[PDB]
Amino acid sequence: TWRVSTGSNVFQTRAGCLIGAEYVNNSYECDIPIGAGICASYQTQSQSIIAYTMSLGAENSVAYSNNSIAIPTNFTISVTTEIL
């Protein structure tokens, strides 16, 4: 019996129809998964709920060549935790 304000932002996704969130062109890490590559979050604009397409990672291009190599000159010691 409750009615959601249909005059607010309405968005169409392959999962269905999303009401109450505005689509933005930025890409962040997924926070609340909606589906079909669409996630949502609560961000400061004022504060509001936004929907976006999740990102996979930053781009990178290796400088390949016929006779070019890269050799490390220093090292680091890492200690990580695993729980089972």
């Binding site: 490390p72 890492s78 695993e82």
Partner: protein
């Protein structure tokens, strides 16, 4: 000394992170929550009627003569049996996963703590050096100690050297150039050295390999003699 300081700093960072509300033991809390929820649901299921006239056995006995009491009690018996059977089956299914996790943990204890493993990303990220175990309620925590390269530099390289109409390859390492000279270095750490007959081996001539160079190779015996 540098490695000792880095190890101590990493351990201190782990301690600091774990002290102030790390909340990283979600996997060990999920088991407790699931078991508690299962038991609470099993207890709450006792208040259903299952199509009878009442959910209390004493009330049914009091309000009806035995012939009707039996037919009213059969329904409750059936429903409660069904609930218990569902609980048992779900417990079996969960125990299977717990056993799989225990087997994985035992294998990891055998291969990461009692030795050094070359399996990639099995005993941590990077190249494995060591691992230490710690206990926790209904679980185990592994501290993996690994070695990570850093601060890379760019060089020119060749597959083989040519000298006296002979092709020389490095016994263990690569040939690198800083612009005017050629050295031989190990792969994981920059440490150039002079190319000599001690750290290279020869096979063939200079007209088969694709990309050889003309640089010189030093021989110690002749300078040693004279």
């Amino acid at each position: 000394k540098l490695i000792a300081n880095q190890f101590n700093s990493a351990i201190g960072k782990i301690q600091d992170s774990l002290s102030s509300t790390a909340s990283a033991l979600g996997k060990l809390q999920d088991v407790v929550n699931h078991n508690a929820q299962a038991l609470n649901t099993l207890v709450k299921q006792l208040s259903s009627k299952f199509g009878a006239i009442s959910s209390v056995l004493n009330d049914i006995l009091s309000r009806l003569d035995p012939p009707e009491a039996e037919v009213q009690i059969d329904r409750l018996i059936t429903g409660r049996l069904q609930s218990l059977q569902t609980y048992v089956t779900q417990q079996l299914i969960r125990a299977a996963e717990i056993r799989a996790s225990a087997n994985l943990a035992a294998t990891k204890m055998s291969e990461c703590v009692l030795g050094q493993s070359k399996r990639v990303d099995f005993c941590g990220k990077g190249y494995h050096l060591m691992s230490f175990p710690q206990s926790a309620p209904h679980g185990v925590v592994f501290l993996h100690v690994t070695y990570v390269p850093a601060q890379e530099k760019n060089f020119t390289t060749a597959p083989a050297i040519c000298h006296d109409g002979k092709a020389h390859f490095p016994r263990e390492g690569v040939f690198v150039s800083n612009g005017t000279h050629w050295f031989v270095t190990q792969r994981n750490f920059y440490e150039p050295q002079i190319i000599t007959t001690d750290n290279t081996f020869v096979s063939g001539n200079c007209d088969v390999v694709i990309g050889i160079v003309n640089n010189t190779v030093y021989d110690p015996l002749q300078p040693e003699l004279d």
